[PDB]
Design a protein around this nucleic acid. Sequence first.
RNA 1: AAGGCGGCCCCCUGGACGAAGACUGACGCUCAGGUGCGAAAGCGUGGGGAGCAAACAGGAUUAGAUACCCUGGUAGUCCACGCCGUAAACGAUGUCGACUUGGAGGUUGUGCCCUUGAGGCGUGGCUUCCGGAGCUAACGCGUUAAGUCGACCGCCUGGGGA
Lengths: 151, 55, 117, 56
Amino acid sequence: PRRRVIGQRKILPDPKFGSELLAKFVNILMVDGKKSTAESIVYSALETLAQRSGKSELEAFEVALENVRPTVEVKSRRVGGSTYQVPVEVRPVRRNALAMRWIVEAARKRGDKSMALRLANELSDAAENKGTAVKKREDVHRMAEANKAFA
Amino acid sequence: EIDYKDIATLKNYITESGKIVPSRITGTRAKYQRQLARAIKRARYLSLLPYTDRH
Amino acid sequence: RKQVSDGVAHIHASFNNTIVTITDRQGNALGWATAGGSGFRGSRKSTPFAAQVAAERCADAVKEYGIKNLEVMVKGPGPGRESTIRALNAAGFRITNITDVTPIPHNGCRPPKKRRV
Amino acid sequence: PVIKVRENEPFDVALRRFKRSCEKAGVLAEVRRREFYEKPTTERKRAKASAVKRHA
RNA sequence: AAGGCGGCCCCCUGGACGAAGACUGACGCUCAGGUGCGAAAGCGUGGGGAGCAAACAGGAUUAGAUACCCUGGUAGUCCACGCCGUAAACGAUGUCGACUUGGAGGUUGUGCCCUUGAGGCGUGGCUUCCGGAGCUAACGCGUUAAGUCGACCGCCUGGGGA
């Protein structure tokens, strides 16, 4: 968008819980336009990640997101002929997007049997402040603290 | 009639750090500005005026 | 390590680095910290953030002396001229005076030649 | 550019006053001017160009 | 006069300008050859040497880097006395004189007026920018002419070789 100011598309709420967060999570987990295949995975993972804790589902999902949500990230910049990394503050919508994308890529990089099990384990790890999604968030925060001088 | 001994008058044409103010700021004639510069330098020599704000 | 309560913060703000030295009223140094010695090399060293953290670490090198009121003498054109002053005020210090003591030659020695970069 | 922080003034206004005084004194411009040698022909040409562009 | 000349003080010293007069009475202008002055670099002798910095050394960059950049660094830069006599030594515009609409400034004298004022109005010297006629191939110059003339001098005759 050189000049384009752009609005926002209408995302439908989740059929089971009525959450836009879960709808976007299903959208991020979906491949090849297979929304019904992704919804079953997300629902099975949320169910399995419900009995473990005890705070229903949506609450457990938000607890897992709270540990993967990055507050500050670095933006590459080419000014002084070299790699400038200015730590910029992340917006809440981009915060949720990054958290969900990291959780999905971390669950797909697992050795469990089904994607539902991988998701359940990744979300349980995130709620316990461990895993590879929390690892990536700490990596990003580390890279931001290193370049804090370039704010 | 600018006298290097008239420190009360010379202090009006120097900044807080002791530097001479330009003639564009005070709007004084070029001739009397040259006389003022000479008088301020002489008064700096006689230690009646400071060279700088340090010493 | 006795109590002073009257210090001077000598800030040497060069283009490539920033050196903060806290001395007593007479001029005897009590502690010092630099931008290059605080974990910054190359491009990060000549930044106001490096000067700020250097002023933070230098204020910790004098906590055993119990300084309450200290002066600020800034010298140099480099960055960190005001960043170090802010980092010193934020460290629980009563800034009493701020003074610029950058050396100005009255047309004295000949400076180096221009860089044809 | 000596700044004495007078009573009943916060630190921030004293720092801004110090910056204003050091810029009105022109110490940074001078120390940036004196770091490299400028030939007499170069400074004369620069002064002439500045006096010419100060005509608008 | 040009090259140039920049803290302050003293000693010696040249030129320019202005006011009102007095004086000499063409004593003037230009000038081949001649003579003198002539930035910087350079040379000789004797000093001095902080900073800077040809050469030089090392570190980088690079395909190479005998360079730009970085760390040092000798001559030199400084002083006295001689030599050198060259520069884009330029206004790329020889000197002297006369005449030709203007505007805004700068700098330095001088005169007049309840001096109202740091005022206004005249009158000289030098100086910056714009611009009219005119001139120019054009750019532009334009009362400080590259306009209209006069005196004398220097110089040019296709590009290289040179």
